[PDB]
mmCIF file of C-alpha atoms and ligand atoms in Angstrom:
data_model
loop_
_atom_site.group_PDB
_atom_site.id
_atom_site.type_symbol
_atom_site.label_atom_id
_atom_site.label_comp_id
_atom_site.label_asym_id
_atom_site.label_seq_id
_atom_site.Cartn_x
_atom_site.Cartn_y
_atom_site.Cartn_z
ATOM 1 C CA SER A 276 10.880 -114.733 11.954
ATOM 2 C CA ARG A 277 9.584 -115.590 8.571
ATOM 3 C CA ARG A 278 12.447 -118.520 9.049
ATOM 4 C CA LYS A 279 10.449 -119.810 11.843
ATOM 5 C CA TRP A 280 7.373 -119.717 9.873
ATOM 6 C CA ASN A 281 9.019 -121.705 7.093
ATOM 7 C CA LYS A 282 10.166 -124.092 9.725
ATOM 8 C CA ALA A 283 6.902 -124.758 10.895
ATOM 9 C CA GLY A 284 5.211 -124.682 7.442
ATOM 10 C CA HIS A 285 8.147 -127.707 5.697
ATOM 11 C CA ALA A 286 7.303 -130.001 9.005
ATOM 12 C CA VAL A 287 3.773 -130.234 8.847
ATOM 13 C CA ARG A 288 4.042 -130.585 4.747
ATOM 14 C CA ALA A 289 6.450 -133.327 5.446
ATOM 15 C CA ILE A 290 4.134 -134.994 7.381
ATOM 16 C CA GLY A 291 1.240 -134.180 4.678
ATOM 17 C CA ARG A 292 3.758 -136.170 1.912
ATOM 18 C CA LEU A 293 4.738 -138.736 4.203
ATOM 19 C CA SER A 294 0.957 -139.583 4.584
ATOM 20 C CA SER A 295 0.835 -138.920 1.055
ATOM 21 C CA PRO A 296 3.740 -140.962 -1.468
ATOM 22 C CA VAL A 297 3.820 -140.361 -4.717
ATOM 23 C CA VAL A 298 1.816 -142.450 -7.267
ATOM 24 C CA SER A 299 4.081 -145.194 -8.961
ATOM 25 C CA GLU A 300 1.713 -147.255 -11.425
ATOM 26 C CA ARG A 301 -1.068 -144.962 -12.636
ATOM 27 C CA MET A 302 -4.150 -147.671 -13.882
ATOM 28 C CA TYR A 303 -6.628 -147.653 -15.631
ATOM 29 C CA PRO A 304 -9.203 -149.296 -17.879
ATOM 30 C CA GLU A 305 -9.354 -148.958 -22.036
ATOM 31 C CA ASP A 306 -10.413 -151.011 -24.471
ATOM 32 C CA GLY A 307 -11.094 -154.415 -22.087
ATOM 33 C CA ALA A 308 -7.953 -154.036 -20.593
ATOM 34 C CA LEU A 309 -6.429 -152.814 -17.609
ATOM 35 C CA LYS A 310 -3.845 -150.336 -18.677
ATOM 36 C CA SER A 311 -1.041 -148.446 -17.197
ATOM 37 C CA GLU A 312 1.383 -145.668 -17.541
ATOM 38 C CA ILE A 313 4.511 -145.171 -15.189
ATOM 39 C CA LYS A 314 6.334 -141.443 -15.549
ATOM 40 C CA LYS A 315 9.328 -141.981 -13.163
ATOM 41 C CA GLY A 316 12.622 -142.526 -14.976
ATOM 42 C CA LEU A 317 16.376 -143.301 -13.849
ATOM 43 C CA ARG A 318 18.441 -141.959 -11.172
ATOM 44 C CA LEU A 319 22.300 -141.006 -12.369
ATOM 45 C CA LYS A 320 25.458 -141.601 -10.215
ATOM 46 C CA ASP A 321 25.922 -137.943 -11.233
ATOM 47 C CA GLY A 322 22.614 -137.003 -9.340
ATOM 48 C CA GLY A 323 20.958 -136.397 -12.503
ATOM 49 C CA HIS A 324 17.714 -137.834 -13.560
ATOM 50 C CA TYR A 325 16.955 -140.105 -17.073
ATOM 51 C CA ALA A 326 14.026 -139.721 -18.040
ATOM 52 C CA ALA A 327 11.070 -143.179 -18.927
ATOM 53 C CA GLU A 328 7.895 -143.439 -19.831
ATOM 54 C CA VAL A 329 6.488 -146.479 -19.636
ATOM 55 C CA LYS A 330 3.361 -147.853 -21.311
ATOM 56 C CA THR A 331 1.927 -151.045 -19.959
ATOM 57 C CA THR A 332 -1.247 -153.218 -20.603
ATOM 58 C CA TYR A 333 -2.573 -155.735 -18.698
ATOM 59 C CA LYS A 334 -5.350 -158.751 -19.797
ATOM 60 C CA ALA A 335 -6.849 -161.304 -17.936
ATOM 61 C CA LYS A 336 -7.004 -164.349 -19.605
ATOM 62 C CA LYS A 337 -10.732 -165.133 -18.507
ATOM 63 C CA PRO A 338 -13.261 -162.042 -18.418
ATOM 64 C CA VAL A 339 -12.893 -160.167 -15.281
ATOM 65 C CA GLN A 340 -14.259 -157.434 -13.315
ATOM 66 C CA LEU A 341 -11.936 -154.309 -14.291
ATOM 67 C CA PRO A 342 -11.903 -151.681 -11.758
ATOM 68 C CA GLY A 343 -11.931 -148.352 -12.145
ATOM 69 C CA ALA A 344 -8.592 -145.874 -12.323
ATOM 70 C CA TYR A 345 -6.642 -145.720 -9.300
ATOM 71 C CA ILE A 346 -3.089 -145.351 -8.129
ATOM 72 C CA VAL A 347 -0.205 -148.215 -6.990
ATOM 73 C CA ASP A 348 2.553 -147.356 -4.714
ATOM 74 C CA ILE A 349 5.022 -149.507 -5.275
ATOM 75 C CA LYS A 350 8.525 -149.653 -3.478
ATOM 76 C CA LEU A 351 11.251 -151.728 -4.734
ATOM 77 C CA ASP A 352 14.837 -151.645 -3.546
ATOM 78 C CA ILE A 353 18.126 -153.872 -4.877
ATOM 79 C CA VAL A 354 18.469 -155.827 -1.333
ATOM 80 C CA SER A 355 21.872 -157.615 -2.867
ATOM 81 C CA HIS A 356 24.248 -158.740 -5.719
ATOM 82 C CA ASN A 357 27.276 -160.118 -6.493
ATOM 83 C CA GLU A 358 30.207 -158.098 -8.255
ATOM 84 C CA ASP A 359 29.196 -158.476 -11.545
ATOM 85 C CA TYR A 360 24.644 -159.223 -11.285
ATOM 86 C CA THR A 361 25.038 -162.358 -12.288
ATOM 87 C CA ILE A 362 22.752 -162.997 -8.746
ATOM 88 C CA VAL A 363 20.282 -160.342 -7.895
ATOM 89 C CA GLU A 364 17.948 -160.459 -4.911
ATOM 90 C CA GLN A 365 15.860 -157.912 -5.024
ATOM 91 C CA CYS A 366 12.260 -156.813 -2.745
ATOM 92 C CA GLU A 367 9.446 -154.634 -3.301
ATOM 93 C CA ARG A 368 6.274 -153.554 -1.602
ATOM 94 C CA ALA A 369 3.038 -152.433 -3.097
ATOM 95 C CA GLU A 370 -0.468 -151.005 -2.568
ATOM 96 C CA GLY A 371 -3.120 -149.894 -4.733
ATOM 97 C CA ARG A 372 -4.979 -146.902 -3.745
ATOM 98 C CA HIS A 373 -7.798 -144.544 -5.209
ATOM 99 C CA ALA A 374 -8.470 -170.044 -1.654
ATOM 100 C CA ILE A 375 -6.319 -170.385 -4.074
ATOM 101 C CA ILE A 376 -4.296 -167.300 -3.681
ATOM 102 C CA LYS A 377 -3.104 -168.137 -0.188
ATOM 103 C CA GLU A 378 -1.043 -165.640 2.665
ATOM 104 C CA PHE A 379 2.128 -166.814 1.391
ATOM 105 C CA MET A 380 3.025 -167.685 -2.472
ATOM 106 C CA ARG A 381 6.283 -168.548 -4.126
ATOM 107 C CA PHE A 382 6.881 -167.613 -7.440
ATOM 108 C CA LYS A 383 9.460 -169.206 -10.784
ATOM 109 C CA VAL A 384 10.191 -166.367 -13.577
ATOM 110 C CA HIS A 385 12.068 -166.970 -16.403
ATOM 111 C CA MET A 386 13.104 -163.875 -18.544
ATOM 112 C CA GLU A 387 14.804 -164.177 -22.144
ATOM 113 C CA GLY A 388 16.098 -161.427 -23.728
ATOM 114 C CA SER A 389 17.629 -159.236 -25.648
ATOM 115 C CA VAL A 390 19.581 -155.724 -25.292
ATOM 116 C CA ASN A 391 21.381 -153.829 -27.910
ATOM 117 C CA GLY A 392 21.864 -157.305 -29.826
ATOM 118 C CA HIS A 393 22.610 -159.029 -26.687
ATOM 119 C CA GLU A 394 20.906 -162.157 -25.958
ATOM 120 C CA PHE A 395 20.657 -163.833 -22.205
ATOM 121 C CA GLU A 396 18.240 -165.396 -20.000
ATOM 122 C CA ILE A 397 17.676 -165.051 -16.668
ATOM 123 C CA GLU A 398 16.030 -167.818 -14.071
ATOM 124 C CA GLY A 399 14.452 -166.880 -10.516
ATOM 125 C CA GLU A 400 12.842 -167.561 -7.345
ATOM 126 C CA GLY A 401 10.131 -165.299 -5.445
ATOM 127 C CA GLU A 402 7.477 -165.129 -2.413
ATOM 128 C CA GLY A 403 5.395 -163.304 -0.458
ATOM 129 C CA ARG A 404 2.551 -162.060 0.935
ATOM 130 C CA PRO A 405 0.188 -161.132 -1.632
ATOM 131 C CA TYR A 406 -2.662 -159.480 0.392
ATOM 132 C CA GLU A 407 -0.003 -157.800 2.926
ATOM 133 C CA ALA A 408 1.735 -156.615 0.464
ATOM 134 C CA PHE A 409 5.091 -158.071 0.672
ATOM 135 C CA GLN A 410 7.501 -159.870 -2.278
ATOM 136 C CA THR A 411 11.205 -160.706 -3.099
ATOM 137 C CA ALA A 412 13.283 -162.904 -5.317
ATOM 138 C CA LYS A 413 16.411 -164.221 -6.078
ATOM 139 C CA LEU A 414 16.972 -163.782 -9.777
ATOM 140 C CA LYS A 415 20.293 -165.674 -11.591
ATOM 141 C CA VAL A 416 21.634 -164.771 -15.328
ATOM 142 C CA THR A 417 22.150 -168.345 -16.384
ATOM 143 C CA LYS A 418 22.834 -167.066 -20.197
ATOM 144 C CA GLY A 419 24.754 -164.318 -21.244
ATOM 145 C CA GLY A 420 26.095 -163.032 -18.225
ATOM 146 C CA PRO A 421 27.931 -160.696 -17.354
ATOM 147 C CA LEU A 422 25.342 -158.346 -18.472
ATOM 148 C CA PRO A 423 26.470 -155.436 -20.497
ATOM 149 C CA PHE A 424 23.740 -152.896 -19.096
ATOM 150 C CA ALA A 425 21.999 -151.740 -15.826
ATOM 151 C CA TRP A 426 20.090 -153.835 -13.931
ATOM 152 C CA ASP A 427 17.503 -151.452 -13.652
ATOM 153 C CA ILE A 428 16.161 -151.821 -16.992
ATOM 154 C CA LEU A 429 15.126 -155.284 -15.582
ATOM 155 C CA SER A 430 14.303 -155.078 -12.235
ATOM 156 C CA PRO A 431 10.437 -153.950 -12.747
ATOM 157 C CA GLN A 432 9.902 -156.994 -15.180
ATOM 158 C CA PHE A 433 10.292 -159.539 -12.652
ATOM 159 C CA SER A 434 4.760 -159.568 -10.226
ATOM 160 C CA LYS A 435 1.044 -157.785 -10.562
ATOM 161 C CA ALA A 436 -0.256 -160.392 -7.264
ATOM 162 C CA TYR A 437 1.153 -159.427 -5.035
ATOM 163 C CA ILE A 438 -0.206 -155.771 -4.524
ATOM 164 C CA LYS A 439 -2.603 -154.825 -1.801
ATOM 165 C CA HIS A 440 -5.651 -154.240 -2.804
ATOM 166 C CA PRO A 441 -8.555 -152.016 -0.803
ATOM 167 C CA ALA A 442 -11.625 -154.245 -0.507
ATOM 168 C CA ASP A 443 -13.550 -151.527 -3.172
ATOM 169 C CA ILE A 444 -11.254 -151.963 -5.841
ATOM 170 C CA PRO A 445 -11.591 -155.007 -7.967
ATOM 171 C CA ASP A 446 -8.029 -156.695 -8.055
ATOM 172 C CA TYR A 447 -8.182 -157.665 -11.661
ATOM 173 C CA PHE A 448 -4.160 -159.598 -11.132
ATOM 174 C CA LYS A 449 -6.165 -161.894 -8.410
ATOM 175 C CA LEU A 450 -9.323 -162.445 -9.836
ATOM 176 C CA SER A 451 -7.664 -163.847 -13.058
ATOM 177 C CA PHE A 452 -6.180 -166.800 -11.171
ATOM 178 C CA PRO A 453 -6.024 -169.487 -11.781
ATOM 179 C CA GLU A 454 -5.793 -169.396 -15.615
ATOM 180 C CA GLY A 455 -3.708 -165.775 -15.162
ATOM 181 C CA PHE A 456 -2.762 -163.109 -17.010
ATOM 182 C CA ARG A 457 -0.513 -161.577 -19.603
ATOM 183 C CA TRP A 458 1.151 -158.160 -19.838
ATOM 184 C CA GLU A 459 2.952 -155.870 -22.684
ATOM 185 C CA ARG A 460 4.892 -152.951 -22.007
ATOM 186 C CA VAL A 461 7.004 -150.515 -23.555
ATOM 187 C CA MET A 462 9.242 -147.899 -22.441
ATOM 188 C CA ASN A 463 10.923 -145.144 -23.853
ATOM 189 C CA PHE A 464 13.979 -143.286 -22.264
ATOM 190 C CA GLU A 465 15.118 -140.206 -23.057
ATOM 191 C CA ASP A 466 17.760 -140.800 -25.096
ATOM 192 C CA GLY A 467 15.376 -142.888 -27.715
ATOM 193 C CA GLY A 468 15.862 -146.009 -26.126
ATOM 194 C CA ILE A 469 13.397 -148.375 -26.341
ATOM 195 C CA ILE A 470 12.470 -151.805 -24.964
ATOM 196 C CA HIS A 471 9.243 -154.036 -25.550
ATOM 197 C CA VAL A 472 8.449 -156.419 -23.403
ATOM 198 C CA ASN A 473 6.002 -159.358 -23.082
ATOM 199 C CA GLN A 474 4.948 -161.017 -19.495
ATOM 200 C CA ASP A 475 2.834 -164.174 -18.863
ATOM 201 C CA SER A 476 1.538 -165.014 -15.378
ATOM 202 C CA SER A 477 -0.118 -168.710 -14.790
ATOM 203 C CA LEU A 478 -0.215 -170.646 -11.250
ATOM 204 C CA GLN A 479 0.282 -174.295 -11.483
ATOM 205 C CA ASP A 480 0.704 -176.594 -8.521
ATOM 206 C CA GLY A 481 0.268 -173.786 -6.209
ATOM 207 C CA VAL A 482 3.332 -172.040 -7.282
ATOM 208 C CA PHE A 483 2.988 -168.634 -9.754
ATOM 209 C CA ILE A 484 4.887 -168.969 -13.232
ATOM 210 C CA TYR A 485 5.862 -165.482 -14.497
ATOM 211 C CA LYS A 486 7.498 -165.913 -18.463
ATOM 212 C CA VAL A 487 9.259 -162.643 -19.917
ATOM 213 C CA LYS A 488 10.451 -162.183 -23.388
ATOM 214 C CA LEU A 489 12.193 -158.734 -23.587
ATOM 215 C CA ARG A 490 13.749 -156.535 -26.387
ATOM 216 C CA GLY A 491 15.915 -153.388 -26.088
ATOM 217 C CA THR A 492 17.337 -151.583 -28.725
ATOM 218 C CA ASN A 493 18.690 -148.115 -29.400
ATOM 219 C CA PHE A 494 20.830 -147.589 -26.663
ATOM 220 C CA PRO A 495 23.801 -145.121 -27.429
ATOM 221 C CA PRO A 496 26.583 -147.116 -26.173
ATOM 222 C CA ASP A 497 27.963 -144.514 -24.014
ATOM 223 C CA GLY A 498 24.826 -143.902 -22.934
ATOM 224 C CA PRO A 499 24.478 -143.851 -19.025
ATOM 225 C CA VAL A 500 21.708 -148.014 -19.310
ATOM 226 C CA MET A 501 24.880 -149.783 -21.592
ATOM 227 C CA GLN A 502 27.401 -147.998 -19.003
ATOM 228 C CA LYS A 503 26.046 -149.195 -15.902
ATOM 229 C CA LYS A 504 25.563 -145.811 -14.452
ATOM 230 C CA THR A 505 22.459 -145.757 -13.255
ATOM 231 C CA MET A 506 21.088 -146.294 -9.603
ATOM 232 C CA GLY A 507 17.331 -147.120 -8.840
ATOM 233 C CA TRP A 508 14.309 -145.653 -9.702
ATOM 234 C CA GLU A 509 13.057 -142.403 -9.038
ATOM 235 C CA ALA A 510 9.969 -139.573 -9.387
ATOM 236 C CA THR A 511 11.216 -136.643 -10.841
ATOM 237 C CA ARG A 512 12.265 -133.860 -8.671
ATOM 238 C CA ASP A 513 12.937 -129.871 -8.555
ATOM 239 C CA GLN A 514 15.752 -128.574 -7.799
ATOM 240 C CA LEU A 515 16.891 -127.125 -4.513
ATOM 241 C CA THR A 516 17.878 -124.464 -3.919
ATOM 242 C CA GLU A 517 21.153 -123.587 -1.117
ATOM 243 C CA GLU A 518 18.450 -121.855 0.985
ATOM 244 C CA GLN A 519 15.809 -124.159 0.699
ATOM 245 C CA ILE A 520 18.250 -127.365 2.085
ATOM 246 C CA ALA A 521 19.051 -125.058 5.066
ATOM 247 C CA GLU A 522 15.273 -124.593 5.696
ATOM 248 C CA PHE A 523 14.491 -128.113 5.094
ATOM 249 C CA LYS A 524 17.644 -128.903 7.743
ATOM 250 C CA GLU A 525 15.386 -127.204 10.407
ATOM 251 C CA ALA A 526 12.189 -128.813 9.862
ATOM 252 C CA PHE A 527 14.360 -131.962 10.274
ATOM 253 C CA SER A 528 15.671 -131.197 13.243
ATOM 254 C CA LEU A 529 12.395 -130.982 14.327
ATOM 255 C CA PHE A 530 11.791 -134.425 14.093
ATOM 256 C CA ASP A 531 15.083 -135.520 14.886
ATOM 257 C CA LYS A 532 14.833 -135.221 18.719
ATOM 258 C CA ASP A 533 17.821 -137.066 19.488
ATOM 259 C CA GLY A 534 19.697 -135.346 16.796
ATOM 260 C CA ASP A 535 21.349 -138.993 15.462
ATOM 261 C CA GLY A 536 20.805 -137.559 11.758
ATOM 262 C CA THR A 537 17.235 -140.068 11.409
ATOM 263 C CA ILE A 538 13.829 -140.144 11.855
ATOM 264 C CA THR A 539 12.416 -143.045 13.628
ATOM 265 C CA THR A 540 8.777 -144.532 13.795
ATOM 266 C CA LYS A 541 8.744 -143.261 17.488
ATOM 267 C CA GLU A 542 10.019 -139.339 16.313
ATOM 268 C CA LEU A 543 7.689 -139.550 13.942
ATOM 269 C CA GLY A 544 4.832 -140.776 16.098
ATOM 270 C CA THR A 545 5.916 -138.358 18.638
ATOM 271 C CA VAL A 546 4.989 -135.278 16.533
ATOM 272 C CA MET A 547 2.158 -136.464 14.395
ATOM 273 C CA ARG A 548 0.197 -137.081 18.085
ATOM 274 C CA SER A 549 1.198 -133.842 19.748
ATOM 275 C CA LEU A 550 -0.494 -132.529 16.486
ATOM 276 C CA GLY A 551 -3.216 -134.717 17.334
ATOM 277 C CA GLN A 552 -3.345 -137.360 14.898
ATOM 278 C CA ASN A 553 -3.013 -140.620 15.866
ATOM 279 C CA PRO A 554 -1.650 -142.657 13.123
ATOM 280 C CA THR A 555 -1.299 -146.422 14.267
ATOM 281 C CA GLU A 556 2.314 -148.037 13.853
ATOM 282 C CA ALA A 557 1.795 -150.260 11.310
ATOM 283 C CA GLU A 558 1.367 -146.847 9.395
ATOM 284 C CA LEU A 559 4.190 -145.170 10.675
ATOM 285 C CA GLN A 560 5.968 -147.739 9.488
ATOM 286 C CA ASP A 561 4.707 -147.856 6.108
ATOM 287 C CA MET A 562 5.422 -143.834 5.798
ATOM 288 C CA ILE A 563 9.497 -144.153 6.493
ATOM 289 C CA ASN A 564 9.744 -147.220 4.661
ATOM 290 C CA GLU A 565 8.212 -145.453 1.203
ATOM 291 C CA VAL A 566 10.779 -142.745 2.183
ATOM 292 C CA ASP A 567 13.712 -144.990 3.398
ATOM 293 C CA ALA A 568 15.536 -144.508 -0.924
ATOM 294 C CA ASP A 569 18.351 -147.062 0.152
ATOM 295 C CA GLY A 570 16.501 -149.842 2.191
ATOM 296 C CA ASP A 571 18.935 -149.589 4.867
ATOM 297 C CA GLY A 572 16.101 -149.209 7.446
ATOM 298 C CA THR A 573 16.663 -145.730 8.895
ATOM 299 C CA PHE A 574 14.751 -142.014 7.064
ATOM 300 C CA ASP A 575 17.811 -139.789 7.405
ATOM 301 C CA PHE A 576 18.401 -136.652 5.997
ATOM 302 C CA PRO A 577 19.511 -136.831 2.421
ATOM 303 C CA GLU A 578 16.131 -138.944 1.675
ATOM 304 C CA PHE A 579 14.167 -135.917 3.981
ATOM 305 C CA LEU A 580 15.448 -133.753 0.859
ATOM 306 C CA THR A 581 14.031 -136.300 -2.214
ATOM 307 C CA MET A 582 10.978 -136.051 -0.281
ATOM 308 C CA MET A 583 10.837 -132.173 -0.281
ATOM 309 C CA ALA A 584 12.110 -131.577 -3.593
ATOM 310 C CA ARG A 585 9.470 -134.016 -5.610
ATOM 311 C CA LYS A 586 8.046 -132.825 -8.455
ATOM 312 C CA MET A 587 4.055 -131.836 -7.878
ATOM 313 C CA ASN A 588 1.753 -129.831 -10.316
ATOM 314 C CA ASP A 589 0.161 -126.445 -9.177
ATOM 315 C CA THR A 590 -3.313 -128.444 -8.036
ATOM 316 C CA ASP A 591 -1.051 -130.352 -5.639
ATOM 317 C CA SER A 592 1.181 -127.554 -4.774
ATOM 318 C CA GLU A 593 -1.927 -125.696 -3.791
ATOM 319 C CA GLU A 594 -3.526 -128.429 -1.799
ATOM 320 C CA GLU A 595 -0.995 -128.803 -0.025
ATOM 321 C CA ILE A 596 -0.259 -125.434 1.474
ATOM 322 C CA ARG A 597 -4.374 -125.346 2.119
ATOM 323 C CA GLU A 598 -3.636 -128.486 4.035
ATOM 324 C CA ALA A 599 -0.845 -127.250 5.927
ATOM 325 C CA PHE A 600 -3.274 -124.112 6.781
ATOM 326 C CA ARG A 601 -5.737 -126.635 8.573
ATOM 327 C CA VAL A 602 -3.113 -127.981 10.640
ATOM 328 C CA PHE A 603 -2.568 -124.551 11.954
ATOM 329 C CA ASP A 604 -6.430 -123.047 11.914
ATOM 330 C CA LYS A 605 -7.355 -126.037 14.889
ATOM 331 C CA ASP A 606 -10.277 -124.893 15.142
ATOM 332 C CA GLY A 607 -11.337 -124.397 11.118
ATOM 333 C CA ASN A 608 -12.418 -121.003 11.377
ATOM 334 C CA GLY A 609 -10.227 -119.732 9.027
ATOM 335 C CA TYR A 610 -7.914 -117.655 10.848
ATOM 336 C CA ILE A 611 -4.660 -118.391 12.986
ATOM 337 C CA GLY A 612 -4.927 -117.129 16.268
ATOM 338 C CA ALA A 613 -1.467 -116.500 18.539
ATOM 339 C CA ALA A 614 -3.141 -119.259 20.760
ATOM 340 C CA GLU A 615 -3.637 -121.899 17.697
ATOM 341 C CA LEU A 616 0.007 -121.001 16.469
ATOM 342 C CA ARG A 617 2.017 -121.042 20.149
ATOM 343 C CA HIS A 618 0.113 -125.037 20.322
ATOM 344 C CA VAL A 619 1.278 -125.865 16.994
ATOM 345 C CA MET A 620 4.346 -124.501 17.622
ATOM 346 C CA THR A 621 4.920 -126.402 20.561
ATOM 347 C CA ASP A 622 3.066 -129.518 19.328
ATOM 348 C CA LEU A 623 6.533 -129.458 16.686
ATOM 349 C CA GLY A 624 9.135 -128.864 19.470
ATOM 350 C CA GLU A 625 10.186 -125.454 18.806
ATOM 351 C CA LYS A 626 9.890 -124.124 22.158
ATOM 352 C CA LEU A 627 8.894 -120.315 21.913
ATOM 353 C CA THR A 628 8.346 -116.877 24.209
ATOM 354 C CA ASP A 629 4.976 -114.969 23.683
ATOM 355 C CA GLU A 630 6.957 -112.321 22.196
ATOM 356 C CA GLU A 631 8.384 -114.743 19.276
ATOM 357 C CA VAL A 632 4.380 -115.258 18.934
ATOM 358 C CA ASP A 633 3.440 -112.251 18.943
ATOM 359 C CA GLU A 634 6.506 -111.393 16.240
ATOM 360 C CA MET A 635 5.208 -113.972 14.420
ATOM 361 C CA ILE A 636 2.292 -113.102 14.015
ATOM 362 C CA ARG A 637 3.140 -109.429 13.185
ATOM 363 C CA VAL A 638 4.966 -110.482 10.433
ATOM 364 C CA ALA A 639 2.587 -112.477 9.334
ATOM 365 C CA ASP A 640 -0.972 -110.317 9.652
ATOM 366 C CA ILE A 641 -1.076 -107.693 6.374
ATOM 367 C CA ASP A 642 -4.023 -106.021 7.526
ATOM 368 C CA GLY A 643 -3.541 -106.475 11.378
ATOM 369 C CA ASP A 644 -6.880 -107.823 12.851
ATOM 370 C CA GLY A 645 -3.770 -109.991 15.216
ATOM 371 C CA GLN A 646 -4.744 -113.081 13.135
ATOM 372 C CA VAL A 647 -3.165 -114.782 10.173
ATOM 373 C CA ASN A 648 -6.520 -115.522 7.027
ATOM 374 C CA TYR A 649 -5.186 -117.896 4.415
ATOM 375 C CA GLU A 650 -3.737 -115.366 2.148
ATOM 376 C CA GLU A 651 -1.323 -114.049 4.764
ATOM 377 C CA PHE A 652 0.051 -117.679 5.388
ATOM 378 C CA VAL A 653 -0.012 -118.489 1.708
ATOM 379 C CA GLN A 654 2.292 -114.581 1.867
ATOM 380 C CA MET A 655 4.914 -116.667 4.197
ATOM 381 C CA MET A 656 4.887 -120.062 2.550
HETATM 382 CA CA1 CA B 2157 16.478 -139.359 15.582
HETATM 383 CA CA1 CA B 2158 17.816 -145.098 4.659
HETATM 384 CA CA1 CA B 2159 -8.674 -121.002 14.217
HETATM 385 CA CA1 CA B 2160 -4.780 -110.221 9.657
#
């Protein structure tokens, strides 16, 4: 009965999270530069997390309007690679939230660097849609291959022009062209490994030209970077208990109505329209892209668990519970009545009997007025 409340509450919070993806890069103006922080670290093959801190300074080559502080969601995937990673394909979509850069742009990149004293060069070519929010690139190790460390340390080094910015957030990167921009970056990792990166971005002949210089040092030789034990960048996650996994499985089942192990944009659209929302099919698609961790073009249960485990501060946990309450509290009068509850459960796809609805109210109603107020809801969730 309490389980029924948690099933429903988790599903509504899932919709909330699907509609609000973790920040990837936090942007902030400072000292005449646009700076950023990234708190994502690296998922290890053993399931653990290898923490990183990444600080970047971006600086246009001519004076350009700085924006106010904002957020970039970025999803980067390794689309393919040869056996030893000397040739790699990656792709990414990026979006900012609170004439010469054409609709379609190609780029060329050249990296030279060193990690624990291992010198290498990479040459690459990419393309995408700078306003739409999409890019792909093919990278090839031209010297020092095969690389004796995780590709993941290089992937975020290879394209800021390809970030969709809304109209009221100045696009520092796009506005800097044709002359372009430089960046500098420092990454610290939890075992003391360090990487300094310098980048130059310009526009020649209609093509973006990227130059990168990277120097990594102090990685332990048995550590996960030098032993290739990493699997992509991920945000910090909480550990889930066995019970929670059970709960979240039930919440998942309300979306996956056909039972195929996968949630689709159709299945998600269906629950979201019953709930009275109407997101556009571009939007439903974006929502699944952001949580499709393996990039196989489906949203499955382990990926649903990842979303539900993302580490969130207490302001933010509390806001999401407030938000869940507002969905159940259809009229917004601060009380969930029987009829409001029945309708939300039906909307979620839990068909319930009158008496089951009564027991749900009965178990949540501390003060006995026949409705559930916010404090009583919190107690449930
Ligand atoms: Ca399904
Ligand atoms: Ca997937
Ligand atoms: Ca109400
Ligand atoms: Ca009550």
